[PDB]
Design a protein around this ligand. Sequence first.
Ligand SMILES: O=C(C1CC1)N1CCN(c2ccnn3cc(-c4ccc(N5CCNCC5)cc4)cc23)CC1
Length: 335
Amino acid sequence: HLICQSGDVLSARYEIVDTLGEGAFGKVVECIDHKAGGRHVAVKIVKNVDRYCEAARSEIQVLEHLNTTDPNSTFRCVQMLEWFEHHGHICIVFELLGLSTYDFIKENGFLPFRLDHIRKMAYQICKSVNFLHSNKLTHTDLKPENILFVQSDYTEAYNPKIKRDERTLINPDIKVVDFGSATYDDEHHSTLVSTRHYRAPEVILALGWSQPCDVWSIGCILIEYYLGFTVFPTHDSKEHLAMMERILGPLPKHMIQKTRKRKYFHHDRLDWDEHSSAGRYVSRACKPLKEFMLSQDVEHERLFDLIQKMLEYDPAKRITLREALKHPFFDLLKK
Ligand SMILES: O=C(C1CC1)N1CCN(c2ccnn3cc(-c4ccc(N5CCNCC5)cc4)cc23)CC1
């Protein structure tokens, strides 16, 4: 809620030339940097509101650490150029990227990505997020909006199988953004985790969370890229669990035994009515994971073997990103 338009100058150097979208955090603008030779940059302008200010300060700390640790951006976290304050608002200056993977999907009629692009995107996401994991961090908020294309140019053509006209990226290279929720191992882990697009079961059941909850989110990301829509279309925690059970089978009894989240359960089973309005929906929208496959070719079997390991209920059993990078789905890239 900084009031602004094109022509405004921030920090007496950054001239606004375009909007780059908005959120509950505030807004992003594209600027000309008159003190870096006219370079175009993205500036995130944070709401003067306690919650978003705190996230922003923490993001700045994380970005300074990551960018000092990986000065060449070998691991594809967005580069923060600097930060400043403008009429009391925290402003974070980034290298300018292309649009988010969410925005690309929306502008492509919610059609999914092609499997070769998914492979490359999956590999880069696992590599970047594994880098955070090697530096004692958990992202916690991985979703298509927080993965951005480096360059978003595309070509356009009719697809016979899927009914319609389709955009195809020329280069699908990505970077990871949003470090406003990123948490170090030695920091407090909020067991009351706030609103999230994807919610790992150990997060919902409040069993403790750490790096494996990022692996869960990546599994959900990959299925969304594959289908063009999420397999967990809800904002309600109990309904999330109900959808998990249709897609992945019953919650493990040890996780149900351990959880303090008794609101979700009748004795040892989910407290869920399949004949209610919400039950009727869940039953139609959700089905066993492998039934979402669009082909039984070897390549699709390999993606789905990986997704399934990422969506393992038990966060100890769940595949790590180090293991994920060695999975046969990625062999094509290493030939
Ligand atoms: O902190 C975040 C997330 C949590 C919001 N970041 C960093 C600040 N952002 C950007 C950084 C660096 N580059 N960058 C490009 C866009 C961007 C690009 C294109 C569009 N369009 C183009 C026209 N169609 C609509 C979308 C929107 C935003 C957004 C960003 C957004 C992602």
